[PDB]
Design a protein around this ligand. Structure first.
Ligand SMILES: Nc1ncnc2c1ncn2[C@@H]1O[C@H](COP(=O)(O)OP(=O)(O)NP(=O)(O)O)[C@@H](O)[C@H]1O
Ligand SMILES: Nc1ncnc2c1ncn2[C@@H]1O[C@H](COP(=O)(O)OP(=O)(O)NP(=O)(O)O)[C@@H](O)[C@H]1O
Ligand SMILES: [Cl-]
Ligand SMILES: [Cl-]
Ligand SMILES: [Mg+2]
Ligand SMILES: [Mg+2]
Ligand SMILES: [Mg+2]
Ligand SMILES: [Mg+2]
Lengths: 447, 448
């Protein structure tokens, strides 16, 4: 009946749209900085939750819970980021008679301590990257494990998110220096300096499987997303299906992801991330995001399934409206994350007022955005202007259509990364579809 | 390689987008009044064709042909309206070695003299609305036929388009009066005063079938569009598939449409309009539109087929890349034509500068517009702001999702018809899916 959206930006707008499609009432929250945010305008009601820094606004749990109960909400949608993978917030909602629109706290706990997640996958017969058994207490056993696994190794925060608390070590001296750095950063960022170690995979594709469970033990997958085009770990361009994957591997990986989700009795939407090793064409579980993702639209276009609406439906108590045999991926979709950065200045942030915003339309085109003419993106959270998604019958058609779409997208007053994406789509290595995660790093797409 | 777009507005934008998908270079034209027009920005080059009134700009054939050859274009896409159903311009293009993106002039002649179109359909074994065979010489001849057909009748210009030269006669005296007014109006408008007569069908549903043929004898249909929500003759809300139609009638009408198409060796995209009579559940051919239509995108979403790209593909000599067995309509789409009119003032036109324009997005939404912030829609042409299309798995879902999308569509500075479409979507009759073409005439949505 009524849902509080515990987020901001384009995901808040997105969830709000999903609620209205189901006739659900919407409560937006905003920080002092987000006073002009679009989601606060399109919500049925909006409430200030605290000052600009996320720690006192969007992560201010007592205030979010307070507002939620005060206004008579039945649930809370966390979106992505902020409190979406926070098991304690999830538990507190439940204790308030508020439905956390997402998986259980037990589920968030199990998959949210990434070393424990791995051990759970080994027991659900899911392959995982060779590595340490749980956390390393010392550099000493980090050095011991790393010589057992073989360099290069990657040291990762077990409580980790947003790319923070991850370091490659290519020799013992790097592992020694990187251990203390990552432990420090993790304790600060997460209140948990526990680190685990993995073989650092060098030639792979980032393949992730969308899963969705209901409250009745039914789990399905909506195929894969290919998120190999990455700058500094962070995803820039996502596509569905993967250009390099055959139907037998899609099926084998989808089945692995469904085993993953039910080993932890997973409910609502999540994503299994897999490392697809191009050296032997084997996949490895890397982690689960126990939440909706930025890139969900690429999947929604090829599958025809409204994933956020399905999140709300699953939370309201609906059984899954599709079994696995009803799911098909039709056509090809590619998402471009358009940020307020200048690709001609090595992606230097570009703050300012948007003087002209003209979003493209036409066949195949979906624009996801909270930006509008005269809007100023506050520099304290994010750089996302829009996600553009192109859906065509083939990949080459999506590429041609994407240039078309991207080429008429007017965002003036600030620099954006549209030019980067236009240049990528004209790149012959990209068009070949054959490449790994290092692609941006061992090329110079901007010329 | 290079194509001139012989149109304006949102359809020029649509065409230019389809050209860029194919790697084709684009030449926009514009009237003096259309200097700010979005299609002139996104085109590769833009040229002035002349003064604001269409007669000297967008219907200026000598100037359009000069720019097409001057700039070295291979074809001309006429969109809809203006020169799209002008056989003589199609001929002229062909004589200039320009591919008219559409059917042959011969086909444009056959189906564009509407009484002859009808006669061709009877030979093609396609049902037509009862009436006269050919034109009526005289008011006397109209009187005799109208007595034979039985009142009520509708007198229709044979060279008629844009809904001019059509009026109902419920009795003799009306017919005497209607004949002369319609003959005068059709002469003025079309240079052809010839009228034909049909039974005026009073309880019906507007069901039209999308056709596409290629240059190799292949003709497919992409199912139906239901355009029953009309206001004074003009379409307002379209949906695919028709909510009141089973798949046996879908096949029947599709096969009827396909016979019609190849009866005239039809190439490229056309639409066959049927009258679906709710008294006996019978369909009758009313006319063919030998062109793409305003409402094509609702078909494109349900079928996944890019129709305007397919027009270009067909015009470059491509074999139809779809077979009939492989065409499925999936889910349900509703298009809403959003105009610069005030629905709270009986749709009074609302001229002005648009001061804020915010297109909704999200799941299932597709916006078709040439409008933007600080744009002023000239009051000289077809007054569209945007088409909004919603595509969902079911009709009820589409309705809900369209309220969502329409409710956040911001257009400030002019009044628009957005509030009418929101009131339509909350109407119980519309939601039932059961109504006929006089729905907005028997109902008053704006009071709801
Ligand atoms: N074993 C590995 N070998 C090579 N690269 C890795 C490995 N583990 C992680 N990475 C890279 O580091 C990125 C982030 O890893 P991940 O384990 O997803 O961290 P995260 O902080 O949870 N990020 P998020 O996806 O936002 O939750 C991955 O997308 C890979 O590009
Ligand atoms: N026999 C009929 N009985 C009842 N209504 C009719 C009949 N013929 C036409 N109409 C109505 O008049 C409208 C216009 O007729 P039509 O033959 O489509 O003319 P047009 O000028 O070619 N319009 P267009 O579709 O823009 O090319 C139809 O959509 C019907 O609503
Ligand atoms: Cl994400
Ligand atoms: Cl039309
Ligand atoms: Mg993570
Ligand atoms: Mg990850
Ligand atoms: Mg007509
Ligand atoms: Mg018509």
């Amino acid at each position: 009946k009524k849902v509080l959206i515990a987020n901001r930006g384009e995901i808040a707008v997105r969830i709000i749209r999903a609620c209205r499609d189901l006739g659900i009432q919407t409560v937006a929250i905003y920080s002092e900085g987000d006073k002009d945010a679009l989601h606060t305008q399109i919500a049925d009601e909006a409430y200030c939750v605290g000052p600009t820094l996320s720690k006192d606004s969007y992560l201010n749990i007592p205030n979010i819970l307070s507002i939620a109960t005060s206004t008579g909400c039945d649930g809370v949608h966390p979106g992505y980021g902020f409190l979406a993978e926070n098991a304690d917030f999830a538990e507190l909602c439940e204790a308030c008679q508020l439905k956390f629109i997402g998986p259980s706290y037990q589920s968030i706990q199990k998959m949210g301590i990434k070393d424990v997640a791995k051990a759970e996958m080994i027991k659900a017969n899911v392959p995982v990257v060779p590595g340490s058994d749980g956390l390393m207490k010392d550099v000493s056993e980090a050095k011991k494990i790393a010589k057992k696994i073989g360099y290069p190794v990657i040291i990762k925060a077990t409580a980790g998110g947003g790319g923070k608390g991850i370091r490659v070590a290519r020799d013992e001296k790097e592992l020694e220096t990187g251990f203390r750095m990552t432990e420090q950063e993790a304790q600060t960022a997460f209140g948990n300096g526990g680190l685990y170690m993995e073989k650092f995979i060098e030639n792979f594709r980032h393949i992730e499987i969308q899963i969705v469970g209901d409250s009745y033990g039914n789990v399905i997958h909506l195929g894969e997303r290919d998120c190999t085009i990455q700058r500094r770990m962070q995803k820039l361009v996502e596509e569905a299906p993967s250009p390099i994957l055959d139907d037998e591997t899609r099926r084998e990986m989808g089945n692995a992801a469904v085993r993953a989700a039910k080993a932890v009795n997973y409910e609502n939407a999540g994503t299994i991330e897999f490392i697809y090793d191009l050296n032997d064409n084997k996949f490895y579980f890397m982690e689960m995001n126990t939440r909706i993702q930025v890139e969900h639209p690429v999947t929604e276009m090829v599958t025809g399934i409204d994933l956020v609406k399905l999140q709300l439906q699953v939370a309201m108590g609906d059984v899954l409206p599709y079994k696995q045999e009803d799911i098909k991926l039709t056509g090809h979709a590619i998402e471009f994350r358009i940020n307020a950065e200048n690709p001609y200045k090595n992606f230097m942030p570009s703050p300012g007022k948007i003087e002209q915003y003209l979003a493209p339309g036409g066949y195949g085109v979906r624009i996801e955005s909270a930006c509008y003419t005269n809007y100023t993106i506050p520099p304290y959270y994010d750089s996302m202007v829009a996600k553009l998604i192109i859906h065509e019958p083939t990949r080459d058609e999506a590429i041609m259509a994407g240039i078309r779409a991207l080429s008429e997208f007017v965002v003036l007053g600030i620099d954006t990364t549209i030019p980067f994406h236009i240049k990528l789509l004209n790149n012959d290595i990209f068009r070949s579809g054959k490449f790994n995660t290092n692609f941006l790093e061992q090329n110079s797409i901007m010329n």
